[PDB]
């Protein structure tokens, strides 16, 4: 099984998207 083809897009594209989305939502909060 080719693991780089699964984890490299996950760590370079999907995880950064999730991380900056969550951080943008948390930063712009008004509690």
């Amino acid at each position: 099984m080719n693991f780089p083809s699964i984890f490299v897009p996950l760590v370079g594209l999907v995880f950064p998207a999730i991380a900056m989305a969550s951080l943008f939502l948390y930063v712009q909060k008004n509690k």
């Binding site: 998207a17 989305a21 943008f24 939502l25 712009q28």
Partner: protein, 160 residues
């Protein structure tokens, strides 16, 4: 006197110019879906997504890394769809950042003449959420329609 103050007000940070307040330009801007306040934001989002997803396919297909291969029609189009998946996502985050559930619309309630106007539902949580969903649906529909026109139905085109 061609350049006027902004709605007769010289102390507002703007000016009235033929590029700004022409009757034809005002008509064209008012008939755009983003400035159709009385219409459902779902429909305006659908129209905006259709136009943008339709125009996004061309650059990805013609300038992609696989533009000279057999997979030029599909993969680049997929990339365009991917961009829509990104773009709507950004819109969704905007809809969570700006508007709250319990607040009403923050759109202006007046016009240039100063008459009372119902505020646009777009500047609200539900309105922007509906707009974003319509944008996503229209974007994927427009990408699919562009792929169908260029490569599935094989309509004749210059393809740049």
């Amino acid at each position: 006197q061609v350049i006027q103050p902004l709605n007769g007000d010289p102390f507002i940070g703007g000016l009235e110019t033929p590029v700004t307040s022409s009757p034809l330009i005002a008509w064209y801007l008012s008939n755009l879906p983003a400035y159709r306040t009385a219409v459902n934001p779902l429909l305006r989002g659908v129209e905006v997504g259709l136009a943008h997803g339709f125009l996004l396919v061309g650059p990805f297909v013609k300038a992609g890394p696989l533009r000279n291969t057999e997979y030029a029609g599909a993969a680049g189009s997929l990339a365009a769809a991917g961009l829509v998946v990104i773009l709507s996502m950004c819109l969704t985050m905007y809809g969570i950042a700006s508007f709250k559930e319990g607040e009403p619309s923050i759109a202006p309630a007046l016009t240039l003449t100063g008459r009372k106007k119902q505020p646009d539902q777009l500047q609200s949580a539900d309105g922007w959420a509906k707009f974003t969903g319509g944008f996503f649906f229209g974007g994927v529909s427009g990408v699919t329609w562009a792929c169908f026109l260029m490569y599935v139905l094989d309509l004749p085109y210059y393809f740049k």
